[PDB]
């Protein structure tokens with residue numbers, strides 16, 4: 001195959017999403033999260049050479065972070081916080097890049113995945129009011 | 141054009157501004173901010189081979205920082221603090237350069253972007269009494 | 281064709297061996313509790329094999345997953361345990377050739393710092409808890 | 420024109436000074452400052468191959484620091500503390516060199532500039548009872 | 560004669576042991592120690608290409624550590640804690656390897672040796688209820 | 700001709716001294732200082748291939764430090780503490796060498812110089828009961 | 840002749856000792872010290888290719904440290920604590936080696952020397968009940 005699919009962590013809930021393009025990798029990713037519910041609620045992605053925003057979940061949280069990614073820039077560290085099980089949720093993300101940039105969204109009070117690394121190509125999971133489930137997708 | 145436009149973060153308010161000159165990159169950037177309102181209020185920029193000062197917003201704040209940038213010097217780290225939403229504002233900036241220089245202006249109490257990196261060429265956004273909206277522009 | 285790291289913990293539980301000629305370990309998951317301060321359950325996936333190999337009882341309130349690139353090795357590895365006949369594994373720390381690390385469970389009694397290299401399988405004893413755990417590496 | 424002029428920071432007050440010599444770069448720089456007023460008061464400079472001492476301001480402060488600079492030694496980091504506006508003053512300086520030497524004079528309670536870097540050739544500004552205004556000058 | 564013998568530290572007590580094999584170097588070493596007596600009590604060693612476990616002392620302590628050693632891996636730091644004199648004992652060990660592995664057993668409340676370094680080939684000393692005396696053996 | 704004279708810091712008092720030899724560099728330097736007066740009182744220097752001690756001031760202090768300097772060893776960092784003005788004194792010294800050796804004598808409660816660097820050749824200043832004034836001398 | 844003699848620090852008391860052998864450098868050195876008197880009391884040295892133990896002073900202290908030194912291993916840092924004057928003593932030693940090994944014996948409450956560096960070949964000084972005086976000897 002062309003792509004590495006990291007494990008989707010969290011619950012079975014929400015509307016499914018899959019954001020990926022062969023015409024370009026992820027150039028921007030935004031996480032929205034709340035202190036009220038200590039969850040991720042909403043994620044937006046942009047791809048190289050495309051102004052259109054791909055969004056999932058409900059932007060109801062009181063914080064957001066954006067990581068912008070240079071064309072030649074990779075994810076060298078990547079950690080997702082979540083509550084496990086059928087009624088699980090994603091609670092937080094830490095990404096670190098080949099250029100020393102990092103972002104930190106939300107909370108890490110239960111379970112963690114340390115994911116595959118590489119060129120971030122897309123995301124996949126389930127979202128409604130919250131991010132139920134998140135899986136990263138990388139190139140080779 | 142043949143430039144990278146970082147996302148404009150903050151609100152829709154203020155008078156639009158675009159500071160860019162074909163005959164050069166940014167050589168000096170000044171941020172004015174207040175402890176009263178915890179916002180950026182005013183930005184001034186100078187370009188290589190141009191003694192003109194390009195200013196936006198109202199210099200009402202009680203603090204200022206200036207970063208001066210050598211001709212061969214790049215931004216390798218860059219973070220803008222902001223309040224999100226239609227009535228948003230820029231609250232702070234942290235820049236770090238290829239030569240270990242850094243500045244820190246204002247506050248980081250809600251949302252952050254970690255932007256693209258490279259040769260800082262210009263800025264763009266909206267300002268009135270405050271900096272409503274700010275986006276960096278880099279060369280390729 | 282393999283290096284067997286020492287199995288640490290008790291003599292209890294049903295014996296298990298997870299290894300495949302088909303590939304190395306691509307994912308490992310540890311489940312542990314704050315109630316009992318033990319590892320309870322481990323799942324492993326191998327390269328080119330969609331089967332999940334599981335041992336123990338996933339009753340704990342925490343889990344961690346490490347995913348491992350095909351060319352990625354373990355360069356540091358520490359297992360916490362209670363020693364003796366009624367011993368248990370209490371925790372794991374792994375660190376990889378690509379700067380990734382995980383930490384599961386507790387380290388309140390005994391430690392092994394294991395051999396290093398390409399993680400190929402695991403071996404030990406499990407029931408309600410992980411009684412005994414040993415890593416297996418390639419040469 | 421074959422020199423880099425860093426921004427003069429502080430007020431419009433004081434008697435203007437320019438210390439620069441065709442004979443060489445700066446070999447010694449001394450800052451005098453007070454805890455009473457939390458200001459720089461006085462600066463002395465010596466140049467390569469020149470026994471003359473160039474002084475400005477009033478040496479009334481209770482502290483002084485001297486940086487001596489080897490012929491081949493550059494400033495790789497430089498920060499000036501100041502009060503901004505017409506009635507402004509310089510409050511402090513931090514210099515760091517290509518050889519791991521640093522100095523720190525005075526206070527940093529309001530505004531900062533992170534200046535250009537390079538071979539320090541001269542200084543320029545305004546002084547009376549205090550250092551009103553200071554700007555560094557570097558070679559290329 | 561083509562081995563380096565580190566000093567045996569501790570007392571003259573216990574039954575003498577030497578763990579060394581022509582068959583290879585040490586691949587595993589285990590230290591057992593107590594908080595009750597703040598002593599090492601028991602040591603087990605395994606060698607390359609030899610399934611036999613060599614043990615000395617009484618495993619009565621409430622802690623144990625194992626260091627496993629790759630075939631190509633050396634000791635680059637090594638410190639043994641002991642009580643000196645005829646009635647001495649080994650109280651603790653810190654070993655650090657060419658691959659950034661380290662272990663720490665027991666206590667360091669009186670005397671220390673920082674030993675020779677290299678490929679750990681064997682150990683030698685005296686043990687009964689406690690480890691009376693310990694000496695490391697390296698290759699040349 | 701081919702020596703660098705660092706600034707003499709401290710007061711105008713004391714008996715003048717100048718210790719230098721064309722035949723060789725400083726191989727040992729000793730500082731004596733007191734907690735009573737928080738001053739340097741006495742300095743001794745030895746030169747390469749010469750057992751004779753060159754001394755100034757009064758060894759009345761309750762502490763001494765010696766730095767010994769290998770033939771190929773340089774000073775890469777050097778800081779003298781002093782009280783400024785006509786009735787000034789040297790209060791302390793920190794030296795750091797090309798081989799990671801450092802010494803620290805006395806107190807730093809008023810003024811500092813960070814001196815030139817290089818091969819320490821001699822010293823020069825004024826001493827009586829105290830070290831009134833000290834300047835380092837380096838080669839090229 | 841082929842040796843560097845570091846300064847003997849401490850008092851004039853005790854029986855003089857010189858430990859040196861031309862058939863090898865120091866392979867082991869032991870320092871014995873007390874908390875009672877805060878002094879070094881006793882030193883033992885072994886040389887390469889010589890099973891004889893060379894000892895001076897009275898082993899009455901409640902602590903000992905041993906450093907073992909590989910054939911190719913040098914001292915890169917070395918500090919001796921002492922009381923100065925005719926009735927002086929050595930109070931402590933810190934050695935650091937080319938292989939990252941270090942030891943620390945006794946106390947450092949008055950005077951320090953940072954000695955020459957290199958291959959430790961011998962020691963020299965005066966001892967009775969205490970180590971009155973100690974000086975290191977290095978090769979070239």
Ligand SMILES: OC[C@H]1O[C@H](O[C@@H]2[C@H](O)[C@@H](OC[C@H]3O[C@H](O)[C@@H](O)[C@@H](O[C@H]4O[C@H](CO)[C@@H](O)[C@H](O)[C@@H]4O[C@H]4O[C@H](CO)[C@@H](O)[C@H](O)[C@@H]4O[C@H]4O[C@H](CO)[C@@H](O)[C@H](O)[C@@H]4O)[C@@H]3O)O[C@H](CO)[C@H]2O)[C@@H](O)[C@@H](O)[C@@H]1O
Pocket residue numbers: 152153154155267268269270271272
């Ligand atoms: O770049 C951002 C933005 O800039 C331009 O838009 C701006 C904004 O719409 C707005 O900016 C000015 C206001 O900023 C904040 O809202 C406040 O600082 C506000 O001050 C009023 O409210 C404060 C909070 O309580 C209060 O402390 C102030 O005193 C003030 O309220 C008093 O004064 C105002 C004005 O004089 C009166 O209208 C009020 O009634 C009130 O006075 C009463 O109460 C007082 C206190 O008790 C009392 O002393 C007095 O006697 C009275 O009883 C700021 O006004 O508005 C700007 C209009 O100039 C507007 O330009 C645009 O460029 C936009 O595009 C851009 O995004």
Ligand SMILES: OC[C@H]1O[C@H](O[C@@H]2[C@H](O)[C@@H](OC[C@H]3O[C@H](O)[C@@H](O)[C@@H](O[C@H]4O[C@H](CO)[C@@H](O)[C@H](O)[C@@H]4O[C@H]4O[C@H](CO)[C@@H](O)[C@H](O)[C@@H]4O[C@H]4O[C@H](CO)[C@@H](O)[C@H](O)[C@@H]4O)[C@@H]3O)O[C@H](CO)[C@H]2O)[C@@H](O)[C@@H](O)[C@@H]1O
Pocket residue numbers: 431432433434546547548549550551
């Ligand atoms: O580099 C800066 C600047 O330098 C040159 O310009 C300067 C300035 O114009 C100015 O600098 C000195 C003055 O700085 C401040 O204004 C004050 O620090 C001022 O001191 C007065 O105020 C102090 C704070 O209250 C006070 O502590 C002082 O005592 C003083 O006030 C007393 O003395 C003044 C002068 O004699 C009187 O006018 C006051 O009434 C007061 O005296 C009464 O009250 C006293 C206190 O209670 C009491 O003891 C006394 O008995 C009386 O009752 C500083 O003087 O002025 C400088 C002139 O020396 C001038 O050079 C230029 O180079 C410029 O370009 C540059 O920017």
Ligand SMILES: OC[C@H]1O[C@H](O[C@@H]2[C@H](O)[C@@H](OC[C@H]3O[C@H](O)[C@@H](O)[C@@H](O[C@H]4O[C@H](CO)[C@@H](O)[C@H](O)[C@@H]4O[C@H]4O[C@H](CO)[C@@H](O)[C@H](O)[C@@H]4O[C@H]4O[C@H](CO)[C@@H](O)[C@H](O)[C@@H]4O)[C@@H]3O)O[C@H](CO)[C@H]2O)[C@@H](O)[C@@H](O)[C@@H]1O
Pocket residue numbers: 571572573574686687688689690691
């Ligand atoms: O590696 C070291 C050494 O090992 C081998 O040699 C060892 C030693 O000779 C020795 O090691 C075990 C002893 O260690 C310490 O000395 C003590 O822990 C000692 O226990 C006695 O003392 C303790 C501290 O006071 C005490 O808590 C213990 O109860 C015990 O003292 C009681 O029991 C002993 C033995 O039964 C009696 O003799 C005492 O009188 C006392 O009993 C009375 O008091 C009790 C406390 O109140 C009370 O309960 C009771 O009713 C009575 O009134 C450890 O024995 O001895 C080892 C033998 O086991 C020996 O192996 C060799 O290999 C050697 O070469 C090596 O160097």
Ligand SMILES: OC[C@H]1O[C@H](O)[C@@H](O)[C@@H](O)[C@@H]1O
Pocket residue numbers: 292293294405406407408409410411
């Ligand atoms: O694993 C803990 C424990 O679980 C159950 O009690 C049984 O399977 C035991 O054999 C085992 O030791």
